[PDB]
Amino acid sequence: SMPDLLTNVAENYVNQDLFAGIEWRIDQDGKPIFQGCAGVKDIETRTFIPKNAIYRIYSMTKPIVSFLAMMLIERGVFRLSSPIQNFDPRFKSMKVIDQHAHIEPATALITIEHLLTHQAGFSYDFSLGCPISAHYRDAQLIEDGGRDLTDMMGVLAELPLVFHPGTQWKYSISTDVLAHIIECATGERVDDLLQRLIFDPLDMQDTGFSLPLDGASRLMEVYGMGLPALKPAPHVLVPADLGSSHPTDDPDFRRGGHGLYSTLDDYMAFANMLLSGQTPEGETLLSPAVLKLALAPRVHFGARGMRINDEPFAGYSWNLLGRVMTDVGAAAYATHLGEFGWSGAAATYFWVDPTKNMTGCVMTQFLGSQHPIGSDMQAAAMSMLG
Amino acid sequence: SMPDLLTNVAENYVNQDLFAGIEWRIDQDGKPIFQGCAGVKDIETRTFIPKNAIYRIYSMTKPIVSFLAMMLIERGVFRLSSPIQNFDPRFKSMKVIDQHAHIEPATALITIEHLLTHQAGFSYDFSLGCPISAHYRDAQLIEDGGRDLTDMMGVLAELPLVFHPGTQWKYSISTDVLAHIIECATGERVDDLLQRLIFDPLDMQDTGFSLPLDGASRLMEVYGMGLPALKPAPHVLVPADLGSSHPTDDPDFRRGGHGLYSTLDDYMAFANMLLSGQTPEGETLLSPAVLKLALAPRVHFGARGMRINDEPFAGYSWNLLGRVMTDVGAAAYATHLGEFGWSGAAATYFWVDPTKNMTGCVMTQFLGSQHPIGSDMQAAAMSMLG
Amino acid sequence: DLLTNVAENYVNQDLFAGIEWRIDQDGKPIFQGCAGVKDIETRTFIPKNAIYRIYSMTKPIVSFLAMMLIERGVFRLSSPIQNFDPRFKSMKVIDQHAHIEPATALITIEHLLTHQAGFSYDFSLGCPISAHYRDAQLIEDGGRDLTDMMGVLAELPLVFHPGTQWKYSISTDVLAHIIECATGERVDDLLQRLIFDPLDMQDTGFSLPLDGASRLMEVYGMRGLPALKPAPHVLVPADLGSSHPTDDPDFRRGGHGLYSTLDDYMAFANMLLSGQTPEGETLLSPAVLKLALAPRVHFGARGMRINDEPFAGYSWNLLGRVMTDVGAAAYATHLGEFGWSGAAATYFWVDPTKNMTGCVMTQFLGSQHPIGSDMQAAAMSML
Amino acid sequence: RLSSPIQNFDPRFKSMKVIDQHAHIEPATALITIEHLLTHQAGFSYDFSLGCPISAHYRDAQLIEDGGRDLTDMMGVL
After folding, report:
1. What does CATH list as the number for A1-386?
2. With an 8 Å Cβ cutoff, are C156 and A230 in contact?
3. Which residues lie below 8 Å from residue B209, measured CB to CB, with a gap of 6+?
4. CB spacing of B129 vs D60 below 8 angstroms
5. CATH number of the domain at C1-383, out of 1.10.510.10, 1.50.10.10, 3.40.710.10, 3.40.50.2300?
């Protein structure tokens, strides 16, 4: 008897000229229970959202690459404690910089676990106030999408970290490092590994670093507004300029922390899989023991809690794949203990809620959103599911 | 439908010339579910691993002697709070040394519990950077295997501890002290007590401080490389020189922390027993209440966690028998809450996992291993068992 | 003659093109010399009354002007700067975790003089705000009027709450600007009337004298993205872009930008021994001079540091560094020795216990060698 | 000068490591200077230091014992 709060949230966002087009699906027990769409592909022509619409998922790439890493751990390729310098010696002899201009040698080696937990000491180009992000931007680590992953890593490896590995948490480019170390450890490319081990088994036929052959007409327009801003830009539906960060048809483009195109249907296949570690037919992608290892809360936060560019993730801890709800009494929106997942910079969002055998995903394209659509849609779904 | 990851790990280790020969068995509900062997007895002749192959188990001696102590506690011989000086007055008036050359009287008495928990303040001959290990080496505590346990204890008793009893944790020679105090308290020899109370009831016919009569041909060769090294020696299969630390046929040789020979089959009998405190026929070796007392997490660690010679045991606490997993979200390899067990210096490893009614043991002979074979095999078994 | 040996070795090792020094005691020269050339390209000798870009040796001059204005009642140490320019109302503070919040204290004149206002500097490595300074071209755009530069700066966050920490900064430029607001006069005119003319410093100013082109020393060094490691110390001419014009009539700043000579700077240094001209005219009373020289900022474990470079045993007063612990010092000095230095390796000191002043003039940006301190040490050892 | 890093004069003193009483070794986070040598704040020890995390290694190396070894060679070992 609960009304469709999901449609209400999405329709209100579209009617208020805040998002061009939105799709969502909530599954329970691996089957759709709520779904919908609102708005259009692009406001310029008001073309309808195509069937199998394609989205730039940005950091919803991270749980996928992290899951691949867990598969490779299970298969014995490396372990959580593996020092990354054993696979790429460019990461030997790291340095650490601080906000007082002091540089010193790193006193701990960066491990696979540090990459998965964002405790390696890396930063991100867009990090406001960061002691090193200016050097990332100078180096065009994120901006230069045409640079091969392997070559970008050589440039990153020469830069200092912003804390000693293992000692702090900061959301970072470490997932890109992870994708690179995966290539070093396996002698295979990360895009090929993702295809064979995850995408093909889950029938995620539209997911990858380049557009599918029939993909151009299905690509959703991205909206929203270098030097990190001191205040948010106005939330206005103007098409976004991506420069050369996110090519549509570059065969060698591959990353760990962003860069995938996907669809609502494909991402739901991945999210549903995370409830069990199995494909719907029962093929095991990751054993229950290693899935538990991956989902267990691993980084706990103090006062201030988990923050990214000072934005809060209230009641969340970090596990090897992304956020995990560890205190409903600290949470800022409806959830259950153990709810996990992640999100992307263009406002795509997903969650998995093992207590309700529930998964949800919201797909839209807005960079620099001032409205937390993902959390609003999660809260709506939670309210609809008893 | 999981593949045999255990055989894969073991075969890869043998094929990579890292270990000469490996045996393993994983039991569930007291019956073998996975087992195998890889490699050879010795690489010099490539003699096949004999049936009932014998291994030097080193500190896998400690859980056995600790279990004996718990049996003696149950039987009223002594208690956890018993001061050891009540049984051997040579341990009266202990002193404590620090890294600043300062020596002072100990402000707490060493108890049975301190010995079982490595909180007594003892160290070990091979401890790098230790304020007292140089004096242990001068005294040849571990090296002089031909010295009677009772006499070695007289030499140890004259040396200072490295902290006040009960105040810190450091992995140590305290299990040897425990074996000695057991002899003082009972008026019996520790090898005889182990034979009567543990080995014979569990039919561990090949376990003891000297080789069985038909044991010489069954003894696995030991490989790998005094002054504690500042960096690991290269991991290379060269036969190890044991000096006079580990005699094969000395009738008075007995210790608490090392020195036992055993077999995969015998050690699995001991490990399976730890699931219940009973023999397979139902004889109670230790009551459920005292078993619970022995297994409950007893020493908890701060930042840095549990470490031995600065090597981590991530997510582990210490109980009266060895390690116990207390945080899967801190663990570095697959496990479940409450998984417990220990390991030896020649890379033998075992675990007990009450959540899965599971036990596992890996037997091999490599001193100074740079590859954590025990944890790799545990992780493989965990991944194979849902 | 340890001073000559140090300077000649520096020249002979191709580390500095040309160096001049003078050390006075009781207002008269006791040691002096020069080594090297004006420019390595033509090997012209160092000219009579050679002109140097003194960079942050501008700061003690502008700070001294502020003390004169305090004495004359224009403002006081506790004056909130927002009372003079409301663009500095409602400041914000940024941290290394991207957190921004309102400042919980007002910036005062004292904060500007002590670098405790929360400002930073464009070239500050690892700074939470220096990227925004560089984007704004605060130092780079020398052609921009001081008054307009301040408007751009005022919109940026501080890096700590005023009064709560120390960080060497652009605050002296803010001070020059606030002096203009408070007096209704230009800082260059004020400096001319109150300091330069009374001390006969006729070659000191923000523009070159009319006959000054042939007297200007060449500036060397590779040292605006802050370097992670020093550039090699090699004598290549420096490109100053538009940061440091020679003939802009409106160019004026508080923290850098002055041209001066060895002789002019020694006149200023000698004056700081007493607050008087050599003739006995008072520029600053003994009481306010004491207030200005007293150690005011004391440092913790790391000591005083600028871009992580140490100033061992030094505390900060209203004009610059002051030696407060000879047993912590890294080079010969005495308790109470004070002074400052500039980015092109110019250096001076005043040592009251010895009635001694010293100045070393050279032009090298990004030096890997502490020429100024080496020369002070040499001079101290020659006493 | 007091602040001179000693590695500028002998590069064998580049990339020093630091050991503790818990067997932990990590890279030194500061360069050894002339002042550190004069003040015994460089982090060196002595062969006869009781309870020291490194003095056993000094004794093994015979730093003080081997007086016949040239100073220059002794330093390479240290």
Report:
1. 3.40.710.10
2. yes
3. B191, B250, B253, B254, B255, B259, B260, B261
4. no
5. 3.40.710.10
